[PDB]
């Protein structure tokens, strides 16, 4: 039962400073080391350090000695990660893992990793379009549909068809930024005598601008 | 300062196909480890030290190697398998290796495309995205472009491109054309034209405003 839940995305300044934590369960948290992991958009992965919560000592990578900054709490069995002097280089996707030390450590826990946005845009909510055929698909024995969710910030949003329903024939795509806004697609294609015989809506989630679309695409 | 190159960075295999990963490291070292990352989640542990199996690992993988190489093999490539192997330095500064993506090998399918013109939603607020997908295709490589009354259109497009699907193991294209309903109405005809390498002939949608 080890676990390892890090805390939600994050949208800092430039120059600010964050603090993600890494809550730990199902094991000694004083008995293990936790260490940190960092992964830019798009790449490679990058180990940062590790904090001895038995101790509170702490050992980094020498790049990101005064960068980051590892602390523990023992009472909530919790690992802490201070960045400072934010750039567009940190922003990445963070992860806490607790390792077990055999012939050397072994990461066998990871937790879920924490999302870090550094930019100085403000959070702003998606206009969600319907994407509906123009009559010319039809040929097609199946039919595609979807919805264009376009200028939000931060990442991430969320989208299900129909609630979930629909799932198979679903394509999100990556979202692209421009102009410092988000804009990303989502198709679902379904067989000619499923739409608009039926109901087919896609379902939209913004968590940063508390954001909650349900868009019914109609011919 | 130790460097660990992985090979191939990219590779299609098709299902029941053995395997084999690299990892080669600048300079000996004593042991190695592996990970599996799929898409949006953490990376897992794969292989310990060399070649101990980590949790949740089917026994088709195997590790070996030893100084400045190392790999992993699948001795029957499943479609669960498919995913991106990190390899690791088991030591300070536990150094990653650049990765390899690892995909599933299917035969070859032409992109279906699909044309969207700008919502009335969209319009009434002033705005006029159009919008294709070219969806389910195999291999990965695509082209895209795009044509207002019949010329290109350079620059101003944003494309995004989904990785293997988990059911069909094809690839997918949306490749958005943002203008003000202005612009929009400015022209009649718009074309969204698709190059496959399983045609030279280019699939085009299109349609006109009016």
């Known amino acids: 039962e080890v676990q390892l839940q890090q805390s939600g995305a994050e949208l800092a300044r430039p120059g600010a400073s964050v603090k993600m934590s890494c809550k730990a369960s199902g094991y000694t948290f004083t008995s293990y080391t936790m260490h940190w992991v960092k992964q830019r958009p798009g790449q490679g992965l990058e180990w940062i350090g590790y904090?001895?919560?038995?101790?509170?000592?702490?050992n980094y990578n020498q790049k990101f000695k005064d960068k980051a900054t590892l602390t523990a709490d023992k009472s909530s069995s919790t690992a802490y990660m201070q960045l400072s002097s934010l750039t567009s280089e940190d922003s990445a996707v963070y992860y806490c893992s607790r390792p077990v030390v055999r012939l050397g450590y072994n990461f066998d826990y990871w937790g879920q990793g924490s999302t870090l946005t550094v930019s100085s845009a403000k959070t702003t909510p998606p206009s969600v379009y319907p994407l509906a055929p123009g009559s010319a698909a039809q040929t097609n024995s199946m039919v595609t549909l979807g919805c264009l969710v376009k200028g939000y910030f931060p990442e991430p949003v969320t989208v299900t068809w129909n609630s979930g329903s629909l799932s198979s024939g679903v394509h999100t795509f990556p979202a692209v930024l421009q102009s410092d806004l988000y804009t990303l697609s989502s198709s679902v294609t379904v067989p000619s005598s499923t739409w608009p015989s039926e109901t087919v809506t896609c379902n939209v989630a913004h968590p940063a601008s508390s954001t909650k679309v349900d868009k019914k695409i109609v011919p | 300062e130790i460097v660990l190159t992985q090979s191939p960075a990219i590779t299609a295999a098709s299902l029941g196909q053995k395997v084999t990963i690299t990892c080669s490291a600048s300079?000996?070292?004593?042991?190695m480890h592996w990970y599996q990352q799929k898409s949006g989640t953490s990376p897992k542990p794969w292989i310990y030290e060399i070649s101990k199996l980590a949790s949740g690992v089917p026994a088709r993988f195997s590790g070996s190697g030893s100084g400045t190489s190392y790999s992993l093999t699948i001795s029957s490539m499943e479609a669960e398998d498919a995913a991106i192997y990190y390899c690791q330095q088991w030591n300070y500064p536990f150094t990653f290796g650049s990765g390899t993506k690892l995909e599933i090998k299917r035969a070859d399918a032409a992109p279906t495309v699909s044309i969207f013109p700008p919502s009335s939603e969209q319009l009434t607020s002033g705005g006029a995205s159009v919008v294709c997908f070219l969806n389910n295709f195999y291999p990965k490589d695509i082209n895209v472009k795009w044509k207002i009354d019949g010329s290109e259109r350079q620059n101003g497009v944003l494309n995004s491109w989904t990785d293997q699907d988990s059911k069909d193991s094809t690839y997918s294209m949306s490749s958005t054309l943002t203008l003000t309903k202005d612009e929009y109405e400015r022209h009649n005809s718009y074309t969204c034209e698709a190059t496959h390498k399983t045609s030279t002939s280019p699939i085009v949608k299109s349609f006109n405003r009016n």
């Open positions: 904090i001895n919560p038995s101790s509170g000592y702490s």
């Open positions: 300079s000996s070292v004593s042991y």
